[PDB]
DNA sequence: TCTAGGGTCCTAGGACCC
DNA sequence: GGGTCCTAGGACCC
């Protein structure tokens, strides 16, 4: 009664596209991210850069410290998007049960499938191959009875490899599996688990569920399940965004309400444009603004609202700026819309 | 080092509504 | 009182 799940993961996706398009960049440390002056962070880096310890989500500044000779790329969304579109069309040749997770990742459900005598291993290898023919990009993949295991498996032989976990293999695989490797277990959670002497799924199996629920709530349950290989989340494919936003971080903090109003005038047409594409009549459930301050704290202010409306966002922004800023500089401002259910 | 942008899901205080 | 809605913020993911 198993499922067969494949998680497909593009290797260094943005850097790979750049290396493909410009071969001079192959053997050198590169990164797609925003400049230090733009107060940017690294989206992604290729292997030569990763060797210096350069990482996704790393402040560009830390990345030039670790790797002085790093070449920084601003990124080309249209090139990445086109590639991602094509990859998803390839998946569709094998199955309709496709859940994209980002531009570079997707879960496939392949339980039903007559594609390679029902072999998930062979379907995975055939998708990676043919992503390579066609796009000249490599992918890694994981095959497992459930989602979170397929995802962890796609990391085990990257880049340009794959890894399979059979139902028989799950108990041995879990035993010494570090909880920090479970998706949704980030640094705060792992630190908290560690302070209780829980480092592996093995540790968590020896735990009482009620205690994990009382200490952690819903994540306590999820953790207790994942530690045991349990993950019933079905592959979706019918997933739609529930919200849409546009936000910008300025090169220099602002201290004047007119500066905030002016940035909002700039962000608004882009919000309108993006919302138009999924809802022409710009009707919505909530809209609101966000500000981030100099001490990196942020605040959001949204309210029930029938239709995307600029003057209301500006009015809301004035309130937020007058009441919550407390004299600080603002490094970021954003606009946000919550969509109507179904 | 000095911390994006665009999302999901989850919890929580307290107003609202029956 | 208890359910639901509204709102703001945290932790994560890519
Ligand atoms: N914090 C992040 C992480 C990633 N990305 C973007 C850049 C990547 O090219 C793409 C995929 O992200 P991953 O985090 O899966 O990393 P890569 O695909 O870059 O590398 P790997 O081969 O390690 O999966 O999404 C981003 O914008 N911000
Ligand atoms: Mg990836």
Is the same domain home to A251 and A323?
yes
- Domain limit, last residue, from A175, A202, A219: A175
Instruction: With respect to residue A235, please indicate whether it lies within any of the assigned structural domains.
Output: no
- A158 ligand 1 Cβ < 6 A: yes
- Which residues of A sit in the known binding site for Mg(2+)? 9, 104
Packing angle between helix A310-324 and helix A257-276, nearest 10 degrees?
A: 140
User: Measured in angstroms, how far is the CA atom of residue A17 from the centroid of ligand 1?
Assistant: 12
| A15 CA: nearest ligand 1 atom | 9
Nucleotide closest to A219 measured between CA and C1': B10
Number of domains in chain A: 4
Footprint of strand C on the protein (CB under 7 A): A 56-57, 101-102, 104-105, 182-190, 286, 288, 297-304, 324
Rounded-to-integer distance, Cα A324 and Cα A174, Å: 46
Q: How far is CA A325 from CA A56, A232, A245, A246, A320, in A?
A: 30, 43, 21, 20, 7
Kindly report the CATH number assigned to the domain that includes residue A145: 3.30.70.270
Q: Are residues A317 and A323 in contact, defined by beta-carbon separation less than 8 angstroms?
A: no
Closest ligand relative to A44 C-alpha? 1
Distance of CA A223 to the CA centre of its chain: 20
Instruction: Give the method used.
Output: X-ray
Q: Are residues A300 and A336 in contact, defined by beta-carbon separation less than 8 angstroms?
A: yes
Instruction: With respect to residue A236, please indicate whether it lies within any of the assigned structural domains.
Output: no
**A89 in catalytic set:** no
Q: Is A240 exposed, middle or buried (0-12, 13-18, 19+ CB in 10 A)?
A: exposed
Is the same domain home to A3 and A102?
yes
- Domain limit, last residue, from A131, A146, A175: A175
| A45 CA: nearest ligand 1 atom | 19
Is the same domain home to A306 and A336?
yes
Q: Which residue is nearest to nucleotide B11 (CA to C1')?
A: A217
Distance A96 CA to C10 C1' (A): 35
Is the same domain home to A85 and A150?
yes
User: Measured in angstroms, how far is the CA atom of residue A183 from the centroid of ligand 1?
Assistant: 14
Residues with Cβ–ion distance below 5 A, ligand 2: A 9-10, 104
Is the same domain home to A45 and A130?
no
Cis preceding linkage at A239, omega within 30? no
Rounded-to-integer distance, Cα A200 and Cα A256, Å: 50
Q: Which residue is nearest to nucleotide C8 (CA to C1')?
A: A300
Rounded-to-integer distance, Cα A132 and Cα A55, Å: 24
Kindly report the CATH number assigned to the domain that includes residue A225: 1.10.150.20
Q: What is the resolution of this structure in A?
A: 2.3
- Output phi, psi for A222, to 5 deg: -60, -40
Question: From the CB of residue A77, how many other CB atoms can be counted at a distance below 10 Å?
Answer: 9
Instruction: With respect to residue A29, please indicate whether it lies within any of the assigned structural domains.
Output: yes
Q: Are residues A219 and A295 in contact, defined by beta-carbon separation less than 8 angstroms?
A: no
Is the same domain home to A207 and A309?
no
Is the same domain home to A162 and A115?
yes
Q: Which of A208, A9, A187, A201 is nearest to A91 (CA)?
A: A9
User: Reduced to 3 states, what is the DSSP secondary structure of residue A172?
Assistant: helix
Where in chain A does DSSP place strands (E)? 5-10, 30-33, 42-45, 71-73, 98-102, 105-109, 139-144, 162-164, 243-254, 286-293, 298-304, 330-338
Nucleotide closest to A13 measured between CA and C1': C14
Instruction: With respect to residue A284, please indicate whether it lies within any of the assigned structural domains.
Output: yes
- Sign of the Cα pseudo-torsion (A202, A205, A208, A214, in order): positive
- Output phi, psi for A197, to 5 deg: 70, 20
Q: Are residues A150 and A144 in contact, defined by beta-carbon separation less than 8 angstroms?
A: yes
User: Reduced to 3 states, what is the DSSP secondary structure of residue A1?
Assistant: coil
Kindly report the CATH number assigned to the domain that includes residue A339: 3.30.1490.100
Is the same domain home to A191 and A142?
no
Is the same domain home to A150 and A5?
yes
Is the same domain home to A200 and A267?
no
Q: Which residue range is the domain that position A56 belongs to?
A: 22-74
Rounded-to-integer distance, Cα A20 and Cα A30, Å: 13
Instruction: With respect to residue A135, please indicate whether it lies within any of the assigned structural domains.
Output: yes
Kindly report the CATH number assigned to the domain that includes residue A53: 3.40.1170.60
Instruction: With respect to residue A237, please indicate whether it lies within any of the assigned structural domains.
Output: no
- A57 ligand 1 Cβ < 6 A: yes
Rounded-to-integer distance, Cα A314 and Cα A323, Å: 14
Instruction: With respect to residue A294, please indicate whether it lies within any of the assigned structural domains.
Output: yes
- Domain limit, last residue, from A175, A200, A215: A175
User: Measured in angstroms, how far is the CA atom of residue A176 from the centroid of ligand 1?
Assistant: 26
DSSP strand pairing (A330-338 vs A286-293): antiparallel
Is the same domain home to A15 and A164?
yes
Question: From the CB of residue A185, how many other CB atoms can be counted at a distance below 10 Å?
Answer: 19
Is the same domain home to A134 and A218?
no
Instruction: With respect to residue A151, please indicate whether it lies within any of the assigned structural domains.
Output: yes
Q: Name the catalytic one among A105, A169, A194, A261.
A: A105
Rounded-to-integer distance, Cα A137 and Cα A20, Å: 7
């Amino acid at each position: 009664g198993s499922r067969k799940i494949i998680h497909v993961d593009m290797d260094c996706f943005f850097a790979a596209v750049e290396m493909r398009d410009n071969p001079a960049l192959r053997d050198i440390p590169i990164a797609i991210g925003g400049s230090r002056e733009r107060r940017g962070v690294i989206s992604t880096a290729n292997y030569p850069a990763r060797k210096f310890g350069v990482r996704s989500a790393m402040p560009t500044g830390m990345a030039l410290a670790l790797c002085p000779h790093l070449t920084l790329l601003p990124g080309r969304f249209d090139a990445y998007k086109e590639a991602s579109n094509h990859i998803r069309e390839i998946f569709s040749r094998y199955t309709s049960r496709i859940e994209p997770l980002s531009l570079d990742e997707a879960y496939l459900d392949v339980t039903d499938s007559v594609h390679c005598h029902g072999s998930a291993t062979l379907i995975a290898q055939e998708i990676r191959q043919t992503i390579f023919n066609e796009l000249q990009l490599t992918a890694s993949a994981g095959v497992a009875p459930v989602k979170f295991l397929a995802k962890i498996a796609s990391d085990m032989n990257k880049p340009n490899g794959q890894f399979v976990i059979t139902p028989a293999e799950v108990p041995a695989f879990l035993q010494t599996l570090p909880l920090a490797k479970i998706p949704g277990v980030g640094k705060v959670s792992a630190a908290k688990l560690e302070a209780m002497g829980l480092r592996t799924c093995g540790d968590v199996q020896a735990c009482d569920l009620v205690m994990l629920l009382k200490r952690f709530g819903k994540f306590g349950r999820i953790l207790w399940e994942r530690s045991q290989g349990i993950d019933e989340r079905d592959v979706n494919s019918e997933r739609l965004r529930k919200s849409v936003g546009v936000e910008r971080t300025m090169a220099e903090d602002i201290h004047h309400w007119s500066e905030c109003e002016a940035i909002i005038e700039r962000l608004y047409p882009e919000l309108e444009r993006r919302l138009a594409k999924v809802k022409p009549d710009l009707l919505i459930a909530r809209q609101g603004v966000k500000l981030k301050f100099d001490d990196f704290q942020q605040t959001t202010q949204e309210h029930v609202w029938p239709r995307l409306n600029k003057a209301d966002l500006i009015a809301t922004a004035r309130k937020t700026w007058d009441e919550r800023r407390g004299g600080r500089g603002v490094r970021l401002v954003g606009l946000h819309v919550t969509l109507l259910d179904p």
